[PDB]
Design an enzyme around this catalytic site. Sequence first.
Site, PDB file in Angstrom:
ATOM      1  N   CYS A   1      20.384  -8.132  -7.384  1.00 48.03           N
ATOM      2  CA  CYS A   1      20.716  -8.881  -6.395  1.00 48.03           C
ATOM      3  C   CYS A   1      20.308  -8.619  -5.547  1.00 48.03           C
ATOM      4  O   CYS A   1      19.545  -8.407  -4.794  1.00 48.03           O
ATOM      5  CB  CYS A   1      22.644  -8.417  -6.703  1.00 48.03           C
TER       6      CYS A   1
ATOM      7  N   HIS B   1       9.814  13.578 -14.420  1.00 47.89           N
ATOM      8  CA  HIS B   1       9.572  14.297 -14.973  1.00 47.89           C
ATOM      9  C   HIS B   1      10.639  14.796 -16.891  1.00 47.89           C
ATOM     10  O   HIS B   1      11.612  15.008 -16.221  1.00 47.89           O
ATOM     11  CB  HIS B   1       9.699  15.716 -14.399  1.00 47.89           C
TER      12      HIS B   1
ATOM     13  N   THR C   1       4.112  14.761 -14.533  1.00 41.74           N
ATOM     14  CA  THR C   1       4.758  14.666 -13.927  1.00 41.74           C
ATOM     15  C   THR C   1       4.853  12.892 -12.992  1.00 41.74           C
ATOM     16  O   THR C   1       3.320  12.984 -12.595  1.00 41.74           O
ATOM     17  CB  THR C   1       5.248  14.877 -11.921  1.00 41.74           C
TER      18      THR C   1
HETATM   19  O1  LIG Z   1      11.182  21.396 -13.353  1.00 44.82           O
HETATM   20  N1  LIG Z   1      11.444  21.697 -14.110  1.00 44.82           N
HETATM   21  O2  LIG Z   1       9.583  22.140 -14.946  1.00 44.82           O
HETATM   22 CU   LIG Z   2      24.953  -9.396  -5.610  1.00 41.83          CU
HETATM   23 CU   LIG Z   3       9.782  21.744 -13.449  1.00 43.89          CU
END
Ligand SMILES: O=N[O-]
Ligand SMILES: [Cu+2]
Ligand SMILES: [Cu+2]
Lengths: 345, 345, 345
Positions: C128, C248, C273
Amino acid sequence: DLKLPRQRVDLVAPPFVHVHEQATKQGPKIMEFKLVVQEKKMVIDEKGTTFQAMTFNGSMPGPLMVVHEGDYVEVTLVNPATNTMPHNIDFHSATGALGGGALTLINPGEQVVLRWKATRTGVFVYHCAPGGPMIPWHVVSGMNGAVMVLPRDGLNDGHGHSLRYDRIYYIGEQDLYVPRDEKGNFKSYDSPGEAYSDTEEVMRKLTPTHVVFNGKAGALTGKNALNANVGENVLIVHSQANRDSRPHLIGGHGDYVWETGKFSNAPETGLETWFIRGGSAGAALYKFLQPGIYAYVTHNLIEAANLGATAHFKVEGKWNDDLMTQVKAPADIPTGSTNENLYFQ
Amino acid sequence: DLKLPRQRVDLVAPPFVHVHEQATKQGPKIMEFKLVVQEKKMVIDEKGTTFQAMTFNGSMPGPLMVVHEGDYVEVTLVNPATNTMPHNIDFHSATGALGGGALTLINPGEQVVLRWKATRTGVFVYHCAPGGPMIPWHVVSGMNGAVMVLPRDGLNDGHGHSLRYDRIYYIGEQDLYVPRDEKGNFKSYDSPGEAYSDTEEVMRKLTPTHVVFNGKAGALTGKNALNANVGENVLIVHSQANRDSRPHLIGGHGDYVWETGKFSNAPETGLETWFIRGGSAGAALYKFLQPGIYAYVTHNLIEAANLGATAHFKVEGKWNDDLMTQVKAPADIPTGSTNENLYFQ
Amino acid sequence: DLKLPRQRVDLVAPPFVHVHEQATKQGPKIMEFKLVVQEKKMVIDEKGTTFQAMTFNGSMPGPLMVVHEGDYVEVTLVNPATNTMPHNIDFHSATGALGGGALTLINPGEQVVLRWKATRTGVFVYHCAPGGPMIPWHVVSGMNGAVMVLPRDGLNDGHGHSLRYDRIYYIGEQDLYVPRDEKGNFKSYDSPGEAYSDTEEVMRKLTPTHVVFNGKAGALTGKNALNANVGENVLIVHSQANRDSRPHLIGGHGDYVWETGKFSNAPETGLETWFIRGGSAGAALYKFLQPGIYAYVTHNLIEAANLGATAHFKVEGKWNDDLMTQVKAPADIPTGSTNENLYFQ
Ligand SMILES: O=N[O-]
Ligand SMILES: [Cu+2]
Ligand SMILES: [Cu+2]
Ligand SMILES: O=N[O-]
Ligand SMILES: O=N[O-]
Ligand SMILES: O=N[O-]
Ligand SMILES: O=N[O-]
Ligand SMILES: O=N[O-]
Ligand SMILES: O=N[O-]
Ligand SMILES: O=N[O-]
Ligand SMILES: O=N[O-]
Ligand SMILES: [Cu+2]
Ligand SMILES: [Cu+2]
Ligand SMILES: [Cu+2]
Ligand SMILES: [Cu+2]
């Protein structure tokens, strides 16, 4: 010793860019630029809040410099005696001596001449860096801009096809740290030195009070919206010398985006939102397909709408109903609608 | 069952790295490492502020482990009975059981032995993760380091060319959350448990009080600057287990950068500033071209200059005036200068 | 004018996804979706804190829409008269009119029909955006979701190989800004309008009080963990409309990750990550190799463990001791251990 032609460039205030060639068959030159430091109070929001700013060439950001790979860039940095502080310049495009900072420290009343070879293509930040805590303070006071080092053959898509822009804009984003008094109102000062202690306390908490394009909230809205036309390929250079940003063109895309800003890397295609890591410049090409108003934001929308970080484009041309259309304008919900049977109720 | 040679590795304190081969023709081995948890008060800034730290092997960061693809990594994690808390270890390089955390929880007075196969190349974070709120607390108390899994043929540029470093350094960046008293001064405690409640309140606001390399402000400046020579290709591994960072080599570049840190991806070329997403390690190669002092920072310059996140390199060799030169040293602005006619005045 | 078949889609609540084809040989269709705005108080943490939320289809995030490149997406946006505020919708996947926002503003009691052509592949945010400060407020109140535009041939690895998922989940991450009273306890309100002024003050400081998946701390833990099996290739779509995130999978990896979320770009391989820039969606494929509990977090672990941003997967299958094994279970440190001679003591 260096026997190359010399070419003086006249800079222009952002978001505009001095004229240049994209592709060139000229050989390397010594491209001569002058940057004059100006300390001054400036207006940074739509309520008229002022700020003790520090600038290159009177603007936030400093102007965009454009050269080609293999050129030499000879910068005369000037610190007029009306200023109060020492200044210098670090070019992230340059190699050695802290990007030039270690060769350019000048007191008020002095100037210095630095030459650096443009060996690395891309868009890059330049910024003041006097030493120690003065480095972030001068940067977040406004002393940062960018330089673009184009390939001699102009931009390409990473897959052997040339890309040419019809139009270029430079969006410098600035995080500002403006003290408030006990009543919560922004404070005013008579000099940068007087503002420093209170400003450093705000800086330390790593939360800006303002995040602005072209030096102030609203700078690139209203009458100063950025112009374009349907069909134009527009290069949007975005820099942030101190803090991350996430640019987004509302209603558009990044057709070709160099997020890290370096033209030896192929651009990414078809981005919704990109990411300018603090301390860098990046660039996006977009070919406009629809007329109208576009917003251009950092997509932390709190920053965009509430701290100043919104620009506009006004794009002329004809609407394409194949790409998007309003099939039915707003109307009362039909009486025979059955929305109370939907799974989420 | 696993019939491979065993090789014991002796770790060294960061920013240095235990000796290893880049390319190897040896086959897979069981590479044996020992990590000993040490809870202790440590000095984290130049004003002598202390902190109740938690470490692997007595350092922030924990030491860099180096293996090759296909090796097995057998880690003996030791929690001496002089410690007060349980600890464990999560290897982001490993597959299963929360990276090892679910197989390594040890009370003071215990040790455990975990083996993981090095199936994924790159640099990766390892960190403690006891459970619940203790996970961020142990991590931001110092319990994180990195492991590098090299290809057996060493690094390459993604385009079929080998890359070899002359020198490697590991920069672990640590966000710290140090309580202050009503007068605004950092508080001291007699144990980590005593520090916890006040520290969690600082953590919750997601603004560190300090951002440091190698465990303290100034750790890698002064006499502990990092050495290099002109012409050396230096690999700079950078980790951040909890929070984003934006590394930059001031006066240099990242010639080849694996921002996300994973060697199955080609590196980006010619970066000014890169981005380490919190919870990862990345790596940059740079070939030094100029002698002198370089700073190495996160390019939030407030963090760099004011919260501790600056390292130095001291580079020996001969200056290259073609790349950069001071054409004219600082001098008074000429009397016949005409700067008052410039467009920005 | 547009003479294509019409196909009505029934959405489902996240983290699940309505059924669809990956690859298709069907041609373009008009894919019809209905989104109904619902303002309501919702529970956002494990202590029962409530929040004045604003939603599409009753959920945070809004549901995932799935179409193919070249389809037309015809969205009926409904704002029932039980709501108090105007609403609209911006599709980051769409071209023109602020992604649709400028064509979809509806008051309570109204509906509107927007069609946009799915010309850009990837996962994209929708949200929105009524205008001005109402834009971030509606977004951080919950009014955001995502749309996936698949290539007609399904996903591929960027190197000519098809990738097919066995399972898909949509993780919408929400930054929330919940006021506290002088005693430090979260405040409750009777309407969104009543909550606004205090909420805007929290928003301005750019530090969320909560960071949640699927609308609340603990939403995807406990009995609502996400299921998978060893060997399944699982696509995990992650969106964040306002603020960066760093996903991650604890104990796993991202085998193929489109961090910027756009399928015209090859995915990165083997990430620990990844990074979702605020204002975007990204996607990761992972083939599970080990059974057990996995956590899925943003890897600011303070956010993950202390502000709500942890999900679980429960994965069935057989453990692979080659990939990881506990060689020796926790045991007392041997009496003949010599750890006091280690380099760091
Ligand atoms: O934060 N765990 O890899
Ligand atoms: Cu809205
Ligand atoms: Cu980690
Ligand atoms: O009003 N500015 O200091
Ligand atoms: O410094 N960046 O968010
Ligand atoms: O897509 N506008 O935030
Ligand atoms: O002094 N440190 O707790
Ligand atoms: O958690 N990172 O900025
Ligand atoms: O480029 N030095 O911040
Ligand atoms: O209790 N929520 O406003
Ligand atoms: O807005 N992002 O962190
Ligand atoms: Cu300065
Ligand atoms: Cu810099
Ligand atoms: Cu621990
Ligand atoms: Cu948006």
